[PDB]
């Protein structure tokens, strides 16, 4: 069917997204990028752990679905059915090709679109899970199990931030208290001291 | 394309823009006593077969349009020709096109 991932592990080609120049691309195996309680608030799941890549390599969409199934199954087993939120932070955009050979040889050997594969850098987050603080070993074992679906070396890093936000978990709560972050669904909205004063009055009423 | 049958343009005999009548240029009849024709006939007479190339590999679908512009002044009446770009369909003085009209 499809080749093993060692054929397309390395980022050898230029990026090749599906567009008006690449047509006849099959849909990615991964479709859902968020699992668990998507509707959980920002103060309910403070602890965030990342699976961070350590190589400039290419992760297949099949692997990105296998790892999210593995991590999802362990988190529904360990944290219960809804006690977590998984965000896969790679979307497979780079199309990989195939020159199928049943004879022409390398004449006209430009591939048809075989599959979709995401590109990850050294230090880029592959998977993130936010959850309560007591589920830390469950997060670490979930990413450690989901590691085996992926080629190359991944680290597990408990982030300094508060869930799926760009703000640090220590400064987070009192800067919510000072009305610098208004919680808005999954994350927060930053309120700077720069808008019209009617927004400040509406926030400080 | 469509060109009209009258054009007011330069005349080398008049040294001046004058009205011209416009006709399509027709390839004239080959005279038997042009020098190349006489040489061709006496080279083709006798034995030997065909002595000049016969062009077959025809690739153009279109001939360049040539207009015989003839000055209308009776003293001058001078003819010259103006070559326009290639076109499959050519019309001389057909109809000025109209804008914003109903199609039928």
């Amino acid at each position: 069917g499809r080749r093993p991932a060692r054929c397309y592990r390395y980022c050898k080609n230029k990026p090749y997204p599906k567009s008006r120049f690449c047509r006849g691309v099959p849909d990615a195996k991964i479709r859902i990028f968020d699992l668990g309680r998507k509707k959980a608030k920002v103060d309910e799941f403070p602890l965030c752990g990342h699976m961070v890549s350590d190589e400039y390599e290419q992760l297949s969409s099949e692997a990105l679905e296998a790892a999210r199934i593995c991590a999802n199954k362990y988190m529904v087993k360990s944290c219960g059915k809804d006690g977590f939120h998984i965000r896969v932070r790679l979307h497979p955009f780079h199309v990989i090709r195939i020159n199928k050979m049943l004879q022409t040889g390398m004449r006209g050997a430009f591939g048809k679109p075989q599959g979709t594969v995401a590109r990850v850098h050294i230090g880029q987050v592959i998977m993130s899970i936010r959850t309560k603080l007591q589920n830390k070993e469950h997060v670490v074992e979930a990413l450690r199990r989901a590691k085996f679906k992926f080629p190359g070396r991944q680290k597990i890093h408990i982030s300094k931030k508060w869930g799926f936000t760009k703000f640090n978990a220590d400064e987070f709560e009192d800067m919510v208290a000072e009305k610098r972050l208004i919680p808005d669904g999954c994350g927060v909205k930053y309120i700077p001291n720069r808008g019209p004063l009617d927004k400040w009055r509406a926030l400080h009423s | 394309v469509n060109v009209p049958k009258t054009r007011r343009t330069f005349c080398k005999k008049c040294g001046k823009h004058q009205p011209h009548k416009v006709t399509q240029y027709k390839k004239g009849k080959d005279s038997l006593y042009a020098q190349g024709k006489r040489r061709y006939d006496r080279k083709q007479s006798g034995y030997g077969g065909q002595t000049k190339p016969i062009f077959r590999k025809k690739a153009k679908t279109t001939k360049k349009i040539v207009l015989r512009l003839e000055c209308v002044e009776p003293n001058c009446r001078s003819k010259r020709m103006l070559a326009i770009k290639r076109c499959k369909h050519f019309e001389l003085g057909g109809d000025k096109k109209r804008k914003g009209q109903v199609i039928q």
Binding site: - | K58, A59, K60, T61
Partner: protein, 118 residues
């Protein structure tokens, strides 16, 4: 080349076949114009079906050759396709005038039948 001279031979054969096609079409045309009984009307009707359908396959090969970029002068093909269309539209007029029933929706909507000399 032999490929071009091949293509030209099938053009001349097809245009010949269209030539006798239109001639036999106008033959059965004037026989139906002179037809006496009803059964004669439906038989030369059926013969006009046969000839115009033969002619429609011939126009289909002509239009494929007109779409081709291997032919440089297409005035014979365009005139033959026009002649085929002329016969097709005349046949369409005849099949309308014969297949419309006297008291169908078309007849009860507009009877007409001007019959020029009358």
């Amino acid at each position: 080349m032999a490929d071009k001279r091949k293509l030209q031979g099938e053009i001349d054969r097809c245009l010949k076949k269209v030539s006798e096609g239109v001639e036999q079409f106008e033959d059965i045309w004037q026989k139906l114009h002179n037809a006496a009984n009803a059964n004669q009307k439906e038989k030369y009707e059926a013969d006009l079906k046969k000839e115009i359908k033969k002619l429609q396959r011939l126009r289909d090969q002509i239009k494929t050759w007109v779409a081709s970029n291997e032919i440089k002068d297409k005035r014979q093909l365009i005139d033959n396709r026009k002649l085929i269309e002329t016969q097709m539209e005349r046949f369409k007029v005849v099949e309308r005038e014969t297949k419309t029933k006297a008291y169908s929706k078309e007849g009860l909507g507009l009877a007409q039948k001007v019959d020029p000399a009358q």
